[PDB]
Write a protein that binds this ligand. Structure first.
Ligand SMILES: Nc1ncnc2c1ncn2[C@@H]1O[C@H](COS(=O)(=O)NC(=O)[C@@H](N)CS)[C@@H](O)[C@H]1O
Ligand SMILES: Nc1ncnc2c1ncn2[C@@H]1O[C@H](COS(=O)(=O)NC(=O)[C@@H](N)CS)[C@@H](O)[C@H]1O
Lengths: 442, 441
């Protein structure tokens, strides 16, 4: 039943020109488009339009974890360092890690991740191979005290993550739980119109020899990559994919082609198997990573189950992160033109925006009032720019904040019974009837 | 229409009562698999409990937006400096989580957001034509409490809805207060709480006008002083005109004696209220409104240009709801010897299908069918398909507080009937299957 919003009733501080302080296109637009505000180095406030988007992103991620079988919960932001000496990653994050002391001086910390929290929870409740496979997950704020925070949401200190965690009896199991997630990630980024490409990766302080990062190609990458062009026509699986079945063929299908970050690149291995014309070397933004770590946290923390053969054994685990806040940036770094942002439909803070091209005119007002109420009812997320500005000004803002569809309402069109519908993508227009428009959009 | 099978879930039911849990809300939340303590006063929300938190979240959200307030989100960590800028730097004393990063800069884990929302306001809003404006967010606050007691009712890490209003004068802020007031009335009623508005001390937040919202209890931490008569009054309906005149709604809620344990004046309680009406009892505060005027705008130089062409600092208020606390309260108000009694609006599921002869071809098929069909009609449904005995399923269902239970038993099903049970009062009704999937819709 349709999100709805008049601009006179809102909080969108658009910015004149380009903030001295922003180095890349995504940070600039987000600042310009009234989405974001820095409150500290790498710590941001999410202003209402920006918050609106973050939610859309959240919900997609959620839906897809859920479709893959994972169960949501929420862990707290602060964790006892005690937990961390137990697995002994106490010093694994180093300077990058934020330690706190309470009013009783108790080694706490703002959690950069939750491998140890989730294991502690798993071991409290789950005792039998029957309970498995299990995949708990949350979408919660993390803090990494990055040395030099940059690029806005892209490299910040307080940031949002969906982190999930899988729990199987043995190796062959977890290799399945791994693939579920792998597929679910393929869909996730695709539903946000981004071709995120699976690439072999390095586990860092998270353990394991299996890990893929998902990387969207760019012209500003924290990481540089070497791929074969063809990895870009590969199909993604549709909503009816059976996660309960054998997923190997898709995984095969998504790895047989050369894909590598610069961390695990091998040129001698590469020129071997690409035609010289498909080679696209380029930079990319890591939007997520998936890890299999066997018994890292289960061994040294005693996360055992009694298995089908009678005896106790530590479970085989994995973990999987999606940069939910980083996705805002990455999406914009891959969906913009000189006029501003171009949101893909699923993530747009509104589907359509009504631009009243002569405010205060009884006719345009009545016509815009009605479209807005009709569009809301048909369950369409609608922004009505009822502010008191001129045609060019309204076109400028509408472009900038990258709403997918624009409806233009003005004197000479409406006198004849027609408005104009502008698709932001390519910028194509059609003159069409006021009756029509609402139907054609829904 | 949200859907879950218990054999696919994560629901760690606890047998007895955990010895470390004094009040019932807490101990139930733990039995019901809703919660784990990770540190004193700090919690992980287990799947069942998160569902509920989210439904509470959403109820607050809806009424806030109906009241015309606008949602953003502020970060958890704030800079010390901001607090110097206002002189609340010392205001939370030892209840303040004070951090330093790898650069020796002083951060703090926000116990509230009055300054920051001012920092954001002063940055962008310059003209009185931009007001009234109310900005709210739902976000984890922190208070290092002396000794964290009573589970989610008095933790250190908690979830709050903190809303903040901005007006040009005295008059414009009353207007904005009044709205939230009405909005808080509708909010808690939507959880099936009688939350009673009472005059309150403003503490570190400041102000000479503040109403605290209290549900009556016995094992509650606040001492309260009203007269019984308040408990009848109407709760404004979903169709109020917020833009219009609310004062004669505030008048019938303010105007019988409502006072907490502070601000309580006794040679002033016996007089304004007659003999048989008086009642010294206790409660659980679940939200507080504050009007503070220029406390923060003065100090942080947040001015707008007014109607006459001059600058002046804005008049503010703030409005909070202890979202995570409400779980406690609701349970404390909604329970019996058998478990929780979730109000329809906040229940993690509306109905639970209990298969009373698990693995049996008939009852299975009949359950697989109801399940698929309620989900299809958008009814949040939980199928307890656990390989377990009848008594156990009844027990659990009761424990976790789902408002409706569907009992599918072999004899009952052998003739097209299934028993529907309302958890409130244990009303039952033997119904045909077609009958059941409707009805509940
Ligand atoms: N400083 C940061 N700012 C923004 N996003 C980040 C930051 N650090 C990580 N991310 C995002 O979060 C994702 C998960 O990060 S990760 O550390 O590589 N993997 C993990 O933490 C594992 N626990 C998987 S749950 C990253 O792929 C990236 O998209
Ligand atoms: N330690 C705590 N644990 C759980 N809930 C709390 C805690 N402290 C306060 N709350 C809830 O949060 C509500 C608002 O808190 S407050 O401190 O009175 N108000 C404020 O902080 C306002 N500045 C925010 S608008 C309280 O009415 C209470 O129900």
């Amino acid at each position: 039943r349709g999100s709805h919003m008049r601009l006179s009733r809102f909080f969108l501080p658009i910015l004149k020109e380009n903030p001295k302080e922003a180095e890349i296109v995504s940070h600039r637009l987000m600042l310009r488009a009234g989405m974001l505000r820095q409150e500290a180095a790498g710590i941001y406030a999410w202003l209402p339009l920006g918050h609106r988007v973050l939610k859309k992103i959240e919900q997609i991620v959620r839906e897809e974890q859920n479709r893959a079988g994972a169960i949501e919960l929420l862990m707290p932001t602060l964790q006892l360092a005690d937990l961390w000496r137990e697995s002994g990653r106490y010093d694994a994050y180093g300077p990058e890690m934020l330690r706190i002391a309470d009013r009783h001086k108790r080694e706490l910390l703002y959690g950069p991740t939750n491998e140890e929290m989730i294991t502690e929870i798993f071991r409290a409740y789950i005792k039998s191979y029957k309970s498995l496979p299990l995949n708990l997950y949350h979408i919660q704020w993390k803090f990494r005290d990055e040395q030099r925070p940059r690029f806005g949401v892209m490299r910040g200190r307080e940031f949002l993550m969906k982190d999930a965690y899988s729990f199987d009896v043995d190796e062959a199991g977890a290799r399945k739980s791994y693939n579920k997630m792998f597929v679910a990630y393929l869909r996730t980024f695709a539903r946000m119109g981004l071709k995120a490409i699976p690439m072999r990766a390095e586990t860092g302080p998270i353990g394991g020899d299996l890990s893929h990062e998902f990387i969207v190609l760019a012209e500003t990458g924290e990481s540089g990559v070497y791929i074969d062009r063809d990895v870009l026509n590969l199909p993604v699986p549709d909503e009816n994919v059976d996660y309960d079945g054998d997923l190997t063929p898709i995984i095969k299908q998504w790895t047989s082609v050369y894909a590598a970050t610069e961390d695990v690149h091998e040129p001698a291995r590469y020129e071997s198997e690409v035609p010289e014309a498909n080679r696209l070397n380029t930079r990319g933004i890591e939007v997520g990573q998936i890890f299999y770590f066997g018994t890292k946290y289960s061994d040294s923390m005693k996360a055992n189950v009694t298995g089908p053969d009678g005896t106790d054994a530590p479970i085989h685990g994995g973990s999987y992160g999606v940069g939910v806040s980083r996705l805002l940036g990455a999406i914009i770094e891959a969906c913009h033109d000189d006029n501003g942002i171009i949101w893909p439909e699923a993530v747009a803070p509104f589907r359509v925006t009504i631009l009243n091209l002569k405010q205060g005119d009884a006719a345009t007002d009545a016509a815009c009032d009605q479209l807005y109420r009709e569009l809301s009812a048909k369950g369409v997320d609608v922004l009505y720019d009822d502010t008191d500005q001129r045609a060019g000004a309204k076109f400028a803002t509408a472009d900038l904040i990258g709403i997918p569809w624009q409806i233009h309402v003005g004197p000479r069109g409406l006198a004849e019974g027609k408005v104009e519908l502008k698709r932001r993508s390519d910028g194509a227009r059609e003159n069409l009837a006021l009756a029509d428009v609402v139907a054609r959009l829904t």
